[PDB]
Every structure is written in structure tokens, then in C-alpha cells.
Design a protein around this motif. Sequence first.
Motif, PDB file in Angstrom:
ATOM      1  N   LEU A  51      36.513-113.583  43.981  1.00  0.00           N
ATOM      2  CA  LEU A  51      36.287-112.942  45.273  1.00  0.00           C
ATOM      3  C   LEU A  51      36.947-111.572  45.341  1.00  0.00           C
ATOM      4  CD1 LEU A  51      36.703-116.016  47.642  1.00  0.00           C
ATOM      5  CD2 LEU A  51      34.581-114.845  47.039  1.00  0.00           C
ATOM      6  N   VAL A  52      38.169-111.446  44.822  1.00  0.00           N
ATOM      7  CA  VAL A  52      38.853-110.158  44.853  1.00  0.00           C
ATOM      8  C   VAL A  52      38.108-109.137  44.001  1.00  0.00           C
ATOM      9  CG1 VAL A  52      40.966-108.955  44.214  1.00  0.00           C
ATOM     10  CG2 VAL A  52      41.096-111.136  45.411  1.00  0.00           C
ATOM     11  N   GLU A  53      37.605-109.559  42.838  1.00  0.00           N
ATOM     12  CA  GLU A  53      36.840-108.645  41.996  1.00  0.00           C
ATOM     13  C   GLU A  53      35.546-108.219  42.677  1.00  0.00           C
ATOM     14  OE1 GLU A  53      37.545-107.065  39.418  1.00  0.00           O
ATOM     15  OE2 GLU A  53      39.390-108.015  38.705  1.00  0.00           O
ATOM     16  N   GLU A  54      34.880-109.145  43.370  1.00  0.00           N
ATOM     17  CA  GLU A  54      33.667-108.786  44.099  1.00  0.00           C
ATOM     18  C   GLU A  54      33.967-107.770  45.192  1.00  0.00           C
ATOM     19  OE1 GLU A  54      30.674-109.430  43.379  1.00  0.00           O
ATOM     20  OE2 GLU A  54      31.025-110.869  41.764  1.00  0.00           O
ATOM     21  N   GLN A  55      35.082-107.949  45.903  1.00  0.00           N
ATOM     22  CA  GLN A  55      35.439-107.009  46.960  1.00  0.00           C
ATOM     23  C   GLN A  55      35.693-105.615  46.402  1.00  0.00           C
ATOM     24  OE1 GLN A  55      35.197-107.555  50.147  1.00  0.00           O
ATOM     25  NE2 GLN A  55      35.832-105.455  50.622  1.00  0.00           N
ATOM     26  N   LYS A  56      36.255-105.522  45.194  1.00  0.00           N
ATOM     27  CA  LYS A  56      36.456-104.216  44.577  1.00  0.00           C
ATOM     28  C   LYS A  56      35.126-103.516  44.333  1.00  0.00           C
ATOM     29  CE  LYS A  56      40.860-105.237  42.294  1.00  0.00           C
ATOM     30  NZ  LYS A  56      41.545-105.450  40.989  1.00  0.00           N
ATOM     31  N   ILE A  57      34.106-104.269  43.921  1.00  0.00           N
ATOM     32  CA  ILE A  57      32.786-103.679  43.720  1.00  0.00           C
ATOM     33  C   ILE A  57      32.238-103.145  45.036  1.00  0.00           C
ATOM     34  CG2 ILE A  57      30.446-104.104  42.904  1.00  0.00           C
ATOM     35  CD1 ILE A  57      31.614-106.318  41.109  1.00  0.00           C
ATOM     36  N   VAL A  58      32.436-103.889  46.126  1.00  0.00           N
ATOM     37  CA  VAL A  58      31.973-103.427  47.431  1.00  0.00           C
ATOM     38  C   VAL A  58      32.685-102.138  47.823  1.00  0.00           C
ATOM     39  CG1 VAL A  58      31.799-104.025  49.868  1.00  0.00           C
ATOM     40  CG2 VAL A  58      31.358-105.761  48.123  1.00  0.00           C
ATOM     41  N   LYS A  59      34.001-102.074  47.611  1.00  0.00           N
ATOM     42  CA  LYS A  59      34.737-100.852  47.918  1.00  0.00           C
ATOM     43  C   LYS A  59      34.232 -99.684  47.080  1.00  0.00           C
ATOM     44  CE  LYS A  59      39.038-103.190  49.253  1.00  0.00           C
ATOM     45  NZ  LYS A  59      40.485-103.346  48.944  1.00  0.00           N
ATOM     46  N   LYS A  60      33.998 -99.916  45.788  1.00  0.00           N
ATOM     47  CA  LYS A  60      33.528 -98.845  44.918  1.00  0.00           C
ATOM     48  C   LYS A  60      32.185 -98.306  45.394  1.00  0.00           C
ATOM     49  CE  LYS A  60      32.694 -97.814  40.017  1.00  0.00           C
ATOM     50  NZ  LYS A  60      32.602 -98.381  38.641  1.00  0.00           N
ATOM     51  N   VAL A  61      31.234 -99.200  45.667  1.00  0.00           N
ATOM     52  CA  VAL A  61      29.918 -98.767  46.127  1.00  0.00           C
ATOM     53  C   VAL A  61      30.024 -98.091  47.487  1.00  0.00           C
ATOM     54  CG1 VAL A  61      27.650 -99.573  46.858  1.00  0.00           C
ATOM     55  CG2 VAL A  61      28.673-100.468  44.759  1.00  0.00           C
TER      56      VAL A  61
END
Lengths: 91, 68, 76, 114, 251
Positions: free
Chosen positions: D95-105
Motif C-alpha cells: 500500500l505504501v508503494e502504491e501511494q508513492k506512485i500516486v504522489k509521483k503521478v
Amino acid sequence: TKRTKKAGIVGKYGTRYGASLRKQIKKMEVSQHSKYFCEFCGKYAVKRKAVGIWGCKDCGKVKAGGAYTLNTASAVTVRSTIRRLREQTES
Amino acid sequence: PKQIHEIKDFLLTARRKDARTVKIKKNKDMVKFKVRCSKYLYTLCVSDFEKADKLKQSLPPGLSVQDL
Amino acid sequence: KGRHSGYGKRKGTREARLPTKVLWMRRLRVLRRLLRKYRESKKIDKHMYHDMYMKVKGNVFKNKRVLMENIHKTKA
Amino acid sequence: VQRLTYRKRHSYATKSNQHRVVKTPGGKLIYQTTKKRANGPKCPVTGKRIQGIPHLRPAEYKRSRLSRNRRTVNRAYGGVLSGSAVRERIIRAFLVEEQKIVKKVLKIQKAKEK
Amino acid sequence: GRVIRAQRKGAGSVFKSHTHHRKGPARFRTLDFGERNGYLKGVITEVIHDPGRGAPLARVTFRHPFRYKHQKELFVAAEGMYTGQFVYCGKKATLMVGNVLPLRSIPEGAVVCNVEHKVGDRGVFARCSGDYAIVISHNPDNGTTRVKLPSGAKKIVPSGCRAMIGQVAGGGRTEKPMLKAGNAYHKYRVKRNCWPKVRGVAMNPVEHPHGGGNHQHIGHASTVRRDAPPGQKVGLIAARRTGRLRGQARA
RNA sequence: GUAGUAGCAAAUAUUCAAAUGAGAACUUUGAAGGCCGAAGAGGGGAAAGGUUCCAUGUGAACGGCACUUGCACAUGGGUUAGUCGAUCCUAAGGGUCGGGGGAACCCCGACAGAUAGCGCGUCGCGCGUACUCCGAAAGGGAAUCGGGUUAAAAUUCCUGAACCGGGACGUGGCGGUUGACGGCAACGUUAGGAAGUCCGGAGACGUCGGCGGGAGCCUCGGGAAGAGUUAUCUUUUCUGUUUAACAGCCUGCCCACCCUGGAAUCGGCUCAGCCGGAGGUAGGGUCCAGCGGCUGGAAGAGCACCGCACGUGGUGUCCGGUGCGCUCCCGGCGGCCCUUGAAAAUCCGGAGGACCGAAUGCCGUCCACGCCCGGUCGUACUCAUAACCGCAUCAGGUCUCCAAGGUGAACAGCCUCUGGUCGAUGGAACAAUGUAGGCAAGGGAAGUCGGCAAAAUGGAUCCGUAACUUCGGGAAAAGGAUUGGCUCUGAGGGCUGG
RNA sequence: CCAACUCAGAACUGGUACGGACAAGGGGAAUCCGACUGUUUAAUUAAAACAAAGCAUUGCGAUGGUCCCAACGGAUGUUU
Ligand SMILES: [K+]
Ligand SMILES: [K+]
Ligand SMILES: [K+]
Ligand SMILES: [K+]
Ligand SMILES: [K+]
Ligand SMILES: [K+]
Ligand SMILES: [K+]
Ligand SMILES: [K+]
Ligand SMILES: [K+]
Ligand SMILES: [K+]
Ligand SMILES: [K+]
Ligand SMILES: [K+]
Ligand SMILES: [K+]
Ligand SMILES: [K+]
Ligand SMILES: [K+]
Ligand SMILES: [K+]
Ligand SMILES: [K+]
Ligand SMILES: [Mg+2]
Ligand SMILES: [Mg+2]
Ligand SMILES: [Mg+2]
Ligand SMILES: [Mg+2]
Ligand SMILES: [Mg+2]
Ligand SMILES: [Mg+2]
Ligand SMILES: [Mg+2]
Ligand SMILES: [Mg+2]
Ligand SMILES: [Mg+2]
Ligand SMILES: [Mg+2]
Ligand SMILES: [Mg+2]
Ligand SMILES: [Mg+2]
Ligand SMILES: [Mg+2]
Ligand SMILES: [Mg+2]
Ligand SMILES: [Mg+2]
Ligand SMILES: [Mg+2]
Ligand SMILES: [Mg+2]
Ligand SMILES: [Mg+2]
Ligand SMILES: [Mg+2]
Ligand SMILES: [Mg+2]
Ligand SMILES: [Mg+2]
Ligand SMILES: [Mg+2]
Ligand SMILES: [Mg+2]
Ligand SMILES: [Mg+2]
Ligand SMILES: [Mg+2]
Ligand SMILES: [Mg+2]
Ligand SMILES: [Mg+2]
Ligand SMILES: [Mg+2]
Ligand SMILES: [Mg+2]
Ligand SMILES: [Mg+2]
Ligand SMILES: [Mg+2]
Ligand SMILES: [Mg+2]
Ligand SMILES: [Mg+2]
Ligand SMILES: [Mg+2]
Ligand SMILES: [Mg+2]
Ligand SMILES: [Mg+2]
Ligand SMILES: [Mg+2]
Ligand SMILES: [Mg+2]
Ligand SMILES: [Mg+2]
Ligand SMILES: [Mg+2]
Ligand SMILES: [Mg+2]
Ligand SMILES: [Mg+2]
Ligand SMILES: [Mg+2]
Ligand SMILES: [Mg+2]
Ligand SMILES: [Mg+2]
Ligand SMILES: [Mg+2]
Ligand SMILES: [Mg+2]
Ligand SMILES: [Mg+2]
Ligand SMILES: [Mg+2]
Ligand SMILES: [Mg+2]
Ligand SMILES: [Mg+2]
Ligand SMILES: [Mg+2]
Ligand SMILES: [Mg+2]
Ligand SMILES: [Mg+2]
Ligand SMILES: [Zn+2]
């Protein structure tokens, strides 16, 4: 039945140390041995481990609080004071 | 000490080169076959007396068989 | 048979001879055991079991007989 | 009744001088020193025991003295973290890794705003 | 005469601090690039008791800036800290209870604890339970900050000095009466050999200036000058005044 | 001189017969009568001692009388370890390099500094924070158990059966989808890659209280074996009736954990708590403890008893109950702190995956089995009313382990069994004075500085309990009643059966 | 079917004896001193003396207070 009229928890001291000291210590004696609400899990399962340390039996969260109460009066004021300062800086 | 449960297994361990001797112990309700190996003393229990005689004469030659 | 058990043959207090806590523990284990078996056999329901459980802890029933009579009376 | 004595020159009832009473085939009571209780593996934080591993003195876990299956658990972090703790970490990592992708995009859409 | 009790403490021996069960020194991280410019995240793992210290301590784990390993730290716990909390240390750390910031980034009126005196000394002020320092004002020209210490004194410190936001946990400890010599015994058993105290007037002249006489009495002013040599300097040392503090004196 | 005088008086106690001897109240055997009475006058060990240990013998001296005697004297004999310890680790602390002081003896002590080296390849790369030191025969810690054996030693000797740490290769097995398989899961199975680096755990911890479990002991009944009592009574009284480490299998406490499922008419639950939409009850599982069960070890041993010979054979060693019982161990929960109650060696596990085989023969392998190896020092004995210290064989002092039956609240006192012991120089008298223990008409503190001393009270059950008080106490206030024996009555339980 | 021992009561009975030995508070009304528990002159004083919780005062924000050291340095200080 009502075992003691007013002594309460300080009945363990018998007739020693004077009424005023027993009356004075009663406030902290009750507070430090009571259960406190856990903001994390929502249960009244927070008890003092040692002076200033308060751990929740259920969720295992350990919190640094007052010597004989979970939250001191000055602790609440500090949180509001810090919060006000943060809002101005983060404006 | 270890216990052998199968007669076939007992024969295999009796043919080991480190099997120093075999001893026959006849109790009032069974016969115990004990073979002394390097590390362990293996024991086999045979309740049927008649079935024990067949195993007694099936031991490899040269192994010191003793009756207790 | 009860010989040599009079007041002139007692040196320890009644508590020392047999603690009140021991008697209380025996009674609760007997009564709680009785309530569980009645619930298992469906003589009483869980609602009545809970009510009787708290009264036993409350020192309402002093022995097995009175508890049985109360259950029969309550069910009627 | 038969009374006993220490079988060694240790004369004080220390934790390492514990014993049990054994009756021998000779019909006599005798002491046999018993090793102290061991905790066994425990979780780093909660302190609950790690399932599937016996409680032994540290030297009794030595590979030469204990079979491999008794000192391992077939799972990631087996023998170190409980099953619940491993589950919590896996979900947190994903979940934390997925949230990083959302922040990046999310910052790429705002970066082009000009 | 002989060496008085006050003089025998300096030699150490039976007056050394009892530190066998202490968990180690409680201090900030060593000042590094990460805290000087940005912020570094840490996690509180446990809040522990330190014998002889009223304030609880917090164990914090940090990711080492340039080595592949964990970096363990021991902080004086601030009121409100809890296990699993994220703690941020650095110039750009947000103003929240538990974070460690340089005084330059802390606005006036904030409550802080474990304030550094020298940049990088890792904390010397306001470390006891329930104590804190108040940021008074900043001086951009001199690069210094004014803070109010627990004793009520105002001190100038460089703006680079770090401080933890909030007050020290465990406050209100001294309000509870001890009620017993035994409780005092256990308190000082884990601190040092300073209890019980025998009154000087109860001793003989050989071992104390107050000793002797057919009545227990000092016999001379208990106020002694600042420059009195060791063994003579007992009582109220360099007292500007004596007696009950009434009126503005007790301010 | 004192003077054969003071003196030999605590710790209940000796008696009879016989043997030995020049000589016996004191040596030895047997019988009787007593004591220690399991917090011992019993059985061990740590310090300390150092041969006091064992056998034989003995002129003198010594053992405050005596001795045939011996902790004395003389001669000789006796202490056996891979598994018990030291050894290893670190604690408070100690000793130090460099540096800083110091006329120097010395002071500080890793604090002024090019650390020690380690790891992996095969001399190279990588890592590298100034002590590879001393400091525990009660802290931490690799591994040994029964049976037997000496005049004197043994977890050390003998026999049997195991284990630990190393070293080396062989055979078989296992894996290659290069690095196993099973379970939804908790996890299970005997094997089933891997370097630098990194992370966790064990080691590892206070105290008090209540419950639960295990072991040993105590205790009750039956069976069989021997013994005691027997004018009378007694299917009776007493002794015993055994099972080690280690290996396999089973069991699965109290907890913890997993799956299904979705709870108010809230339920579950402890002696006490307490638990549940953060998933209870319920149903079905996993794991953990064991000083638990079965088998192997192992009856071939041990013990008891009955024979035959003067070594050898036979029989038995069985089946149940009981608990606020005692000792030890463990489990889980709760109380207490302005007290939160060591460290390190060592060991286990994990994250990561550089690098590596085979086209199937090599590689890998913490699996099974087989082979070899095991340093040095301590080890006798006392541990005390005679082996230590107190000038001594001194009524003192000196750490700790084991702990039976009866009475009773009770490791109180009193009596008893196992074991130990009658060791305190003896004999005859029964004055004064004394020391220790008692009693006493009538009076009842008049005695005396003073109720000093002694007496009186005392356990338990029921009743009852004032002033004062910090409301907790005072309180067992005070005051009163009851208590034996015998024969009965009532009440309070457990497990099975729809 | 198997149970252990606590409690209560009744009759009878002995020269009123019965916690039969052992064991095991005398009690009350007040004054002085110290609150209490604790400690103390080993070998003439155990106390009203010391300590004590409580109360109050004093110094000190580390370039510091108090103290040790011949010097260098060090204790309080793993402290604030
Ligand atoms: K396992
Ligand atoms: K002097
Ligand atoms: K002191
Ligand atoms: K004082
Ligand atoms: K004076
Ligand atoms: K000794
Ligand atoms: K050795
Ligand atoms: K040791
Ligand atoms: K320890
Ligand atoms: K042996
Ligand atoms: K063993
Ligand atoms: K020996
Ligand atoms: K003595
Ligand atoms: K006389
Ligand atoms: K008088
Ligand atoms: K006391
Ligand atoms: K200083
Ligand atoms: Mg919960
Ligand atoms: Mg009792
Ligand atoms: Mg009660
Ligand atoms: Mg004071
Ligand atoms: Mg004086
Ligand atoms: Mg003077
Ligand atoms: Mg004379
Ligand atoms: Mg005399
Ligand atoms: Mg005489
Ligand atoms: Mg005598
Ligand atoms: Mg004699
Ligand atoms: Mg006696
Ligand atoms: Mg006796
Ligand atoms: Mg004892
Ligand atoms: Mg003589
Ligand atoms: Mg001798
Ligand atoms: Mg000699
Ligand atoms: Mg050893
Ligand atoms: Mg040290
Ligand atoms: Mg030196
Ligand atoms: Mg030098
Ligand atoms: Mg250095
Ligand atoms: Mg070393
Ligand atoms: Mg050493
Ligand atoms: Mg040891
Ligand atoms: Mg011996
Ligand atoms: Mg650990
Ligand atoms: Mg208590
Ligand atoms: Mg028990
Ligand atoms: Mg369930
Ligand atoms: Mg068997
Ligand atoms: Mg036999
Ligand atoms: Mg004990
Ligand atoms: Mg891996
Ligand atoms: Mg010996
Ligand atoms: Mg002896
Ligand atoms: Mg002894
Ligand atoms: Mg001497
Ligand atoms: Mg009794
Ligand atoms: Mg007794
Ligand atoms: Mg008279
Ligand atoms: Mg009279
Ligand atoms: Mg009278
Ligand atoms: Mg008079
Ligand atoms: Mg007169
Ligand atoms: Mg008197
Ligand atoms: Mg009174
Ligand atoms: Mg007056
Ligand atoms: Mg007093
Ligand atoms: Mg004294
Ligand atoms: Mg004196
Ligand atoms: Mg005296
Ligand atoms: Mg006052
Ligand atoms: Mg100087
Ligand atoms: Zn919570």
C-alpha cells in the motif's frame, strides 16, 4: 456495603502520616491506578506502567504522559499552543 | 537403545559389518532379539515363540549369537 | 464419627482450621458446574444461565439444593 | 524417610542448582540436576512466542543437536516474526508503494501547468 | 578537626553516582547534513523507564544517512509521545510535539525541551520531568535566540541550537508526598549516597562547624561568605537574604 | 609458704552378663533402660585446616580421673574424570599502552593516538569506533546414567547403556523446473543452494498474593512374602513390594494462534479478574509445557523370601483410592513502586542474492550409517559442645542443601520411627550457706527509692465492648458464657446412566 | 456407584472434670517526652538522643554551583 466513610483507597495507611497528607495523596493515588481512554483503539484499557509511562493493554500502544495522570493540564495547553503556532507558519 | 518394529528391518541391521553380536532373551510372553551395533543396541520383540525360531536360524553366519 | 471435635478440642480459629475462602471456592465451583450442565442439557437457556450465574457470584444460593429449587420455581 | 544430598560440590540453592528427585532401579531416591526454564523465540515488539519452535536452552538449539525442521518455520521471516506481523508488513509495503506512485503521478499533472 | 561530610564527597568513593541499571545517555542525534538542511524521519519503538530519572525515555530508530544499517537513539520523551509515532528532526521539520527543530525555525512563544546550549552539544536545558523552555524572541542580526529556562532565567543561545517541541513527560511527580522514610530510601537508592542527612548541630565540633555546645544551636551566623575555604563553607552560602520569602521576593 | 587447699557440679543415665588384658566404673560384643526428636546430638557441601583419612602395632609423654584406649605416638597404605569443577564469559571493579603530570618513588587511566585485526579469494581485494588483559569453585555456561566394586576412592574404578565437541573420508538417500514437498490457514515433514553486508530473538533477570499442573514424600484399601503379638482379643501389628540417563511413539495442560461464521432478549467467563463487529459464543484445527503415558534401555539388574551346597537354583516384585497435606519445579493471572529490579561469551533464526551445475552427469546436500580422536590442575578427611577462629579437645563465634509419624492453626512445645548417641572423672553421705526449681494458713504491697521478683491473665466458640479520634482506629477495649467422654441426628460433594 | 472433613444440634455419662500436660495478653484512669516504622555508645547509658516524611531557607543556567587533587586532572555527571 460501604466499608469506609471517606478514607477510600488511602485506608491502607491506617492511622499514619496525618489526615492532610492522606487527603493530599488520595487524588494521585486514585488517578495513577485508574483506567484511561485509549485514543487509538477506543477502549478504557490504559494503565500506568511506570511514572510517566502509560500503556494500553489491548492495542499495545505505549504513551508518555504525566507522572500520575495520562494527560496533565499543561499538556493540553501546550498542544493547543503548538497547534496555533503551526497554523500561522503554515498559512 | 532403539527398538526395531519389523523383522525385515532387524535382518538388514544384523548384516551390518559393525554388528558385533546378537543376544536372544526369552521372556514369559515374548522373545527379544538384541543386536549390538556401533552406536545403538537395536531390539526386536517377537510375541509368537514359533515365529521367533524361524528368525533365530536365519541370522547371518559368523555373528555371535547368544541365548539369555 | 464426630468424636473429639467439641469446643474444648479446638486450638486454631475456624478460619485457620478451614479458610472461608476455601468454602467459598468449593461452592462456586459446584454451583458453576451445575449451571453449565443444565445449560448443556438445555434445561435452562443462556438468558437464564447468565441471570443465575451472577446471582451465584452474588452469594444468593448457599448450596446445590437451593439453586435447583430456584431454577424449577423460576421455570414455572 | 530417605533424605538427600547434592551430588556435586554446589552447596547453595541457586537457579543453576535446581534438581528433581528420581527413584532408581536400586530402590533409592537421588537428585538429578534440571536445566533452567527457557523462554524460546519471541516476537521483537509484542513479545508473544513464535509458534512451532520448542523452548530450549541456547546450546540445545545447536544445529548438530536439533533437527532443522524444529528450528524453522516455512514462511518469510519464519521464526522471527509471527504470521500476523508478516501479513501486516506485506500489506504495508504494497500500500505504501502504491501511494508513492500516486504522489509521483499527481505532481506530474501539476508540473506541466504553465 | 576532621574532614567534614561535604568535603568527603569530592573524592568519589562511596559518593559516586549509582548508574548500574541506567539505559545510557539521552541525547539528540549528532548534528549532520540531513538535520542542518532538510529533515530525517525516525520511529519511536518503545518508551522506557530510566532508574534515577523521573522523565521517561524514548528509543528511536533512524535510517543511517550514508551507511546501510539502522541508527539507534535515546531521547528524553516529550509529553504526548507514543510508540509507532514518526519523529522528524531537521531544519524543515514541521512544528509538532516530538519533532526536533533548530531554534531558528521555532516561532516565538513555543514550548520546547532538551534545548542545546552549543550548536551540536545534543541537549542540556529543560530535561527534567514536567520542565520546558519558552522561546522569547529572535535576533536575526546576531543570529541568536532568547529563551526562558525553567528557573525563570532568560538566556541567549545561537539560533542553530536544536530543541524538541513540547514539554518533558512525567510532570507533576514532585506533587505527591512520599509519606515514608522508606520511599525516600528507594528514591535515593538508585541516585547516589546522599540520604539520610545528619544535621550539623547534632555532630561534635571535630567534624562540623555547627557541632558542640551544651545546647543544639549554631552559635554563629549560618550565612557564610562566597570565598570561605572548603570545610568552613557550610550553611547558607553567600546568602543575599534569609527568612520567609514574602511579597515580591518570592516572585 | 599458701596447699594436697580453691577446685572436678550446664547439655536428663546408666545397669547386667560375657570376652580381652598384669591391671576394666571408662575397650569390644550382646541384653535392658534413657536421650537427640527431621530448623537433629541425623546425612552433605562452601570457606578454613592439611593427612587429622585407613590398617596394624605401641616404652614413655599427651587426651586437666583412668584407659587394654586414640583426632596421641610408630610403620605402611590411600585421592584414577572428554561428561563433576577450575579452565571460558562478563559484573562492581582491577591492571595498563599512548598522552598528560612527576626530582624520583609514583599520579590520572583508552582522557591528547597511523588500534587490534577480521573476512573472502589465492599474495591479492573488502572491511576495520585505541585494551584479543585481570576480575565469579553461589552470576552466564557444550556433554553421564543406572547396577556393581575398597580396610580407606569414585556421576572419576568395573560392566552395561548413552551423550558432547572435534577430525576424515566412504556407502546409501535427497535436490536440479539449477536449489524439496504438503496444508485455505495457524503450520507440518528427516534431507531440500549460497558470499560481503544488514536485522531480530535466545542467553536475560524485582517482589508479593491467589489459583492450576507435574514430581517426590505422607496417607487409605486389597493381593501375595517374611516377621512381631497370641492365658484372652486381633481376616490383626510391622517391614518392604523397585525401575536411571538416553531413543522412539503417543498425549497436547495453562496460554497463544488459525479457519468457518456474524452476536441486544447481549453473551462467554475466573477464587479474583476479565473478554467480544479491532469478530464473542459455538463448531473444527495449529502450536507450546512436561519432573505426563507406552515401548525400548530392562530384569539379564536391584530387593525380599524359600532352597541346595558351604558357589548355585526357585518364587514374588501385583491391583486401586485420597488431598486448603508437605518439599521442589512449572503455568497463568493479579497487586506494588518518585524502587521498574546486570552484562558478555555463546547459540538460533531471518532480510538480501553477488557467485555457481547440468543438458543429464556433474554439482550441491544442516539427512542416515560407518571410521578416528578426548590435554592440564583439583578430587582422601573434618566442616565442628574435639579436625576452622577464639593461646586449649574453650557452654562463645562460623555460609548453605535434604527434613518422617502423633497432638495442634503450626518446620510452637511434648512424645515417637530412620540415623545417631549415653561423650561430659567416679564413689559415699543428705549439715550450714549457696545456685536452680516449687509450695504455703489468715492478711493482701503494710515490704521497698520503686510491685524489683513472683503470682495472676492466656487457646478456641458465642455474646458484648466506653472515652477519645487524624474516622483509618481505639479493640483481644472493658464485661459475661461455654469447653471432657460416649451414643446419635442434620447440613454441606464427585463420577456414570435418555 | 465412589467419597474426603468442616460446621451445627441432641441424648446419656463422670467426685463441676474437661484449651485437664504442653501451649498461651493481666486489665483500667491519667501526666511528661517523642508523631509513627526505623537507628544508636561491639564490652556499664536503647533513651526524651539520631534518622524520618512534612516545612522553610541558601547557592547555581556548564566560561557554572559544591567538592577532591603535589601536579595533571577528577567526583556530583549515563547529570541540567
Ligand atoms: K517448526
Ligand atoms: K584534619
Ligand atoms: K546513606
Ligand atoms: K537530619
Ligand atoms: K554548636
Ligand atoms: K568445606
Ligand atoms: K576436565
Ligand atoms: K563460574
Ligand atoms: K543473572
Ligand atoms: K557406570
Ligand atoms: K542427562
Ligand atoms: K573424591
Ligand atoms: K565451638
Ligand atoms: K544445702
Ligand atoms: K508498696
Ligand atoms: K517494625
Ligand atoms: K563542575
Ligand atoms: Mg482485544
Ligand atoms: Mg489452615
Ligand atoms: Mg476473606
Ligand atoms: Mg531533610
Ligand atoms: Mg552528641
Ligand atoms: Mg571546628
Ligand atoms: Mg576439695
Ligand atoms: Mg564449678
Ligand atoms: Mg559428684
Ligand atoms: Mg550433665
Ligand atoms: Mg561415661
Ligand atoms: Mg527434650
Ligand atoms: Mg525424646
Ligand atoms: Mg528448612
Ligand atoms: Mg589423665
Ligand atoms: Mg581414626
Ligand atoms: Mg601423628
Ligand atoms: Mg560441567
Ligand atoms: Mg568495569
Ligand atoms: Mg597502578
Ligand atoms: Mg606511558
Ligand atoms: Mg578515543
Ligand atoms: Mg578473553
Ligand atoms: Mg577471566
Ligand atoms: Mg556457576
Ligand atoms: Mg568417601
Ligand atoms: Mg534478548
Ligand atoms: Mg503486602
Ligand atoms: Mg500443587
Ligand atoms: Mg474457537
Ligand atoms: Mg519395559
Ligand atoms: Mg530378578
Ligand atoms: Mg525454599
Ligand atoms: Mg534467502
Ligand atoms: Mg569425598
Ligand atoms: Mg564422617
Ligand atoms: Mg555438615
Ligand atoms: Mg592466633
Ligand atoms: Mg490436625
Ligand atoms: Mg512440630
Ligand atoms: Mg499465703
Ligand atoms: Mg489461702
Ligand atoms: Mg483482695
Ligand atoms: Mg509503702
Ligand atoms: Mg516502710
Ligand atoms: Mg516484674
Ligand atoms: Mg485504652
Ligand atoms: Mg498538660
Ligand atoms: Mg520514637
Ligand atoms: Mg549496635
Ligand atoms: Mg554499652
Ligand atoms: Mg543496654
Ligand atoms: Mg509540622
Ligand atoms: Mg591543578
Ligand atoms: Zn488501545
